[model samples]
Target: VRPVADFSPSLWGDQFLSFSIKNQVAEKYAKEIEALKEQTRNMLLATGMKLADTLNLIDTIERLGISYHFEKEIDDILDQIYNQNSNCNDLCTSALQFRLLRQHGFNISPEIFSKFQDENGKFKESLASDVLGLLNLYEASHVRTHADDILEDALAFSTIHLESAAPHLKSPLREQVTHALEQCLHKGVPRVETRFFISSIYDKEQSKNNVLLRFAKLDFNLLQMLHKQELAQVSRWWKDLDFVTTLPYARDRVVECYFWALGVYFEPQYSQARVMLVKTISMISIVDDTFDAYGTVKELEAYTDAIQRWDINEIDRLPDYMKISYKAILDLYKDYEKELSSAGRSHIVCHAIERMKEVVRNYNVESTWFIEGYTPPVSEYLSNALATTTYYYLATTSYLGMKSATEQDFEWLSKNPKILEASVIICRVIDDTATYEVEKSRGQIATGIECCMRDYGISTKEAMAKFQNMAETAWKDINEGLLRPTPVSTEFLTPILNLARIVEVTYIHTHPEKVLKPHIINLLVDSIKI
Candidate 1:
């Protein structure tokens, strides 16, 4: 808490508000007071006091102003508190007085500050930061741009605060935290995607309030920063945001951070976990506008129709959003495309890209699949589920994966579609799960086996019956055939198994103890020993 400089010099024109570093005021006041001290020295010397004695007396008088202002302001504020019934009005006046004093090199003592603490131990209200927030708002509109220097300073202070407060924090840990915060303030994918994954885990626990609040704040901040104006001012933040939402490799990184944080903040009392989950799901909805509305309304509708019919051969029928998104995807991969041609990995990258396009093409259609009375075939459903699960698994896991090297070392990631598909699937699954049970009961949601059973006009009960059978068949294929027969290789299968394990752990944390034991025991063995 430092004082701000003198009546800050007026702007060339009227500014919405004035801005200045706090310490400047303190330095300015010190300089002016020193001149006063010299005059006092001569006055006392003329009164027969020794020059040195006069100087000492003047120094004491000057230092006395510090205590005088601090005590006077607090006493006056307390007097208002006793005389006034309205807390808000008293607070407003007190804050005004505080600001005036602060600008003149005065500060509130610790005793006064302690009085503002609430039962919950937080400062009940703070005008100090509020003024700064207002300044930020005014700056956003009138200052013409973000003040990077200010933002960096604020971030540095926040980092120091966190490091000093948190347990077991070291330089490396602090660096990672700083980097993440930097990415976040810069609106980087690492911030959103990481939190997105964390939101998923929090969702599983449901009602973890603390985690949810943090997630909400982060989520809102991410979206808020997305204002194109902010991005234009801070181009680096824009690159990170675009990379996470629009690109493949970057999206995975964003998702991974989300999942990791979700696991970290999985307390039942917090309730924030569930809220974050919903927010994470909502991100896909936010993204819908990007991919589904990028083109003309007519083109989007036509492309969507083809997807509902599971038609993959109709690019011309693809929506405008799809066309643009697909083109953007390819454009992102232009370098990778060139690299594959040189390295003979074109077949792999091409296959992956086409597969990714098909997923988005279908995603455009599949999202609306329920409305048209169509469910995917079993093979398609399994393909989707596995791909969705794997994509999230890989993406979230990759955050730690890339920690050993700089992001610049992973340039191929800029265009890789496998990672993109993974994020898309996570977004897809979360969306489906929201309405899955209800839709299944309504006969509005169908799957491959159910689609095979009825000609699409079945009653709700009939639809549920058909889906139950289809689900059984799919589970049987996965558990009996896939799991029992294949005996997945540990090195490759560990992450896939871990994803399910992570989900189970969340369930136990949320569910009743009676419902948890056997599952928890099994999950532990599978996660640690198996």
Candidate 2:
């Protein structure tokens, strides 16, 4: 008898589809919103503030989630900052400039921090007294390249001081420090949630710009309304699928699935992509559960063959449960094909379809391993596990809804670039580590942890430590891939990067289902107070 894992029902019901808000008030504020946005851009261009102050302001605007309105202006200012031959004497100013520059893909030398080091070549101990500087340095240190020992030191140094200083600060700053310590900007929370928290902190600031603050609040609410509508639309589609009745054994995570898609690309511009990817991921999750918990070897083989064939006739040969999943995938892709055809980019659909098939095939590989009671070596496991990670297909499908995407972009993605590979590794290792014990209890195939133990004759604890190190190394690869000489443009690379960040938030810190529940409620199910 095949092992069956217990999974929960959907946390959200069709009641989430009823999520609606009157946007008329937001509409009344729309003109002022655009005006304030332009004013903020003008502020960026204004020369009254020092370069460091301007960069800090830009950083604030970005953290506030309004930077999407001023991309060109932000780029121009950062470009000007990049070209200028100047250095800041203050620790906070220098570190902030370095972080923002590096984050935007500028080739800034980490040696710039050497000036802050003392005669012994340690970061100046005197700098620890500056709480804000230490906090900024801590945040900045996350963007470091593999070669940047100074940043590695900066991270350790700042983290210690920030923790020490947290108790001494008052009100909002204290909360901010605690929050950053808990969820550093690098570790990945949704930008909207970050903006919501930061807005409250910013509200306490004596010098906060009223125009920017009001605009941030109004814009956040307005966008939240748009997101609610989108969720409702996707929720209806999910309801129509009737997965609860048709696929009761699978994880009912439609809302969670949309939340993941939203994290990958949340701007209003990517709404269609979010919908399509949510459906794709939800289907993949159902299939994943099928392979992991429910499918017999012969049933899985038939399903795999049906997916590989990707035809209605082939799907007829599948078991009833798999037939529902197969038809759902086929119908979803057919809808995508029509959408892409209308855009004159029908060529992209084949890539997306092929990626889905590839993931299913990989799923079959894992099922085979389970059926045969085989534990492959770590290297072989990763080769198959990475495909099963699903980021590759998610990353590929992400481009389908973007106007900037071209035929060549799809071709480039098909080649499995280093960045995507790094992302898959991160996703697979983190997920396997987080769920290893539960999976073991359910008699699942060997995870990365199990494979490592078998290969090295190591304890489970040792195997977990090794997997953690692998995840960290994967992050370094991801950061390196985002550097200035990247193979693809940052616009194209961001979704891939965001997907890795999603994995970090979703799996590394805690059980994804647990950590993501509150976020799902706050982001999709509940509306902000406008």
Candidate 3:
């Protein structure tokens, strides 16, 4: 006997399926986007601008979401500027400098804020008057490590003051302060952040750059066309798969799954990677559903073993329902092999398949715990979840689309580095915390929250608070990896970071209910009004 999940059918029917980008509209967009890009680049490289002014200009380009056109110029500037220390006493300017440098893989020490602190190590009360400075200080503190004690004070002070400051401020500044308090700029998904910035903040700013504004609108709309095209093709595949009828118990949220892939890397060049990732996670979600809600213990044992075999012949080895998932999973990877075969990199799919096998094994472990009503200690639970969260698998798969990721990078990923670990922990803790109620209702109790509460003798609220702190500290670990001389280039490291950003976002209210609906529309369904 198995449980049927409480899921509604998809909220979409051919919304992205029939939609197509027009050729007439497409040409003008490129023509204008190209011209503006040249001007933006010239401004970026010109030496006439002061250091503080250059920082401000770069921030605008970044927030407006056109920076992908100039990663080279920006990286070079940050590298040159980082080595030559520039001094400044202005709080907003200095704080902005620290955030930009730190974000772009420079080793900016948290001590940059020390000049603003007193002999007593408390941030000056006078600093509170500079609202933008408090916001930047608050954001910069998030990148601080467990070792950075002063930032802990920064967070508390900024939080208390920003909370106090929000009520008295005027229109756009008030909105910015309130939003930052809710979601720090550094941790948000770039695509989603760009959408909100273009519509709400940038549109209202009095000193906005008109060229940058127009560039952002054209670029976003152009990409929205590409995104819809991607979803259309992906939708066709899902429609052909017809899992809604065959695998009725599983979640049919193929669009949300695609959005998850988009969140990882929305750059135009990474199209192959984006489509491939969506395909991978969609099947993964089906398998996850089978293990979590539908399959019986005996059925899962057979299915898990069948997954381990990684063979087309395993089809006969499963029940009718299990066979659908089993065949589809292998077939998906087989398709990946063909896509990479010409480059002789099809071997890479083998590595990701191995990670997928590990995930299913761990999934079985959780199913067993729930079945037997066994509550493991938090340590044991996390070791299993570290793999089960599937971030590690997704991270491995993420490398396949970009040839820039070398064999050595995959070798590096296999060792379970801090970046991957932080991603896994954040997803597991945040996802489980968000869905805690459903787990209780589903006749299961050994969730991350449960094990944590039981292990520490803490209440539900306290355990949740602890999980939030764990995620925050892990975020510091993520920031640590992005600094100079990183284990790999920032390109490979980005998807892993972005996955964590996706976790932070989709789980805030959750991937369930109405949480992901607007994201689906904004990034995929609707185009910007140019």
TM-score per prediction, in order, is 0.29, 0.96, 0.97
Better of 2 and 3 by lDDT: 3
Worst 10 residues of 3 by lDDT: 507-516
- Which prediction has the highest lDDT against the true structure? 3
Compose the digit string of candidate 1's lDDT tens values, residues 1-530: 21121121212121111222245543554455455444533443355543233323332222222212123433343344334422222222333333222222233221222244455543443433343222222211111112112222333333344444334444333334343333321112222323332333233333333422342333323222222222122223223435333433112222222333333222222123222232232233223444332333355556545534533455556644354443343443353445445545433333334434444455555445644665676456646544433344233322222112223322333343332333333333333433345446764555433543445566646644555444323222222211212332222222322333343333322222333333222211121110
Better by lDDT, candidate 2 or 1: 2
Candidate 1 global TM-score: 0.29
Give stretches of model 1 more than 4 Å off. 1-297, 301-324, 335-347, 364-434, 437-489, 499-530
Which segments of model 3 are wrong by more than 4 Å?
510-513
Q: Number of clashing pairs, model 1?
A: 29
Off by over 4 Å in 2: 1-5, 20-23, 508-510
Please list the Cα RMSD from the true structure of every candidate, rounded to 1 decimal place.
25.5, 1.8, 1.4
Per-model CA lDDT versus the true structure = 0.33, 0.81, 0.86
**Residue 34 of model 2, lDDT score:** 84
Reference-based lDDT, residue 306, model 3: 87
Report lDDT (Cα) of residue 430, candidate 3. Answer: 90
The 10 consecutive residues of candidate 1 with the worst lDDT sum are 139-148
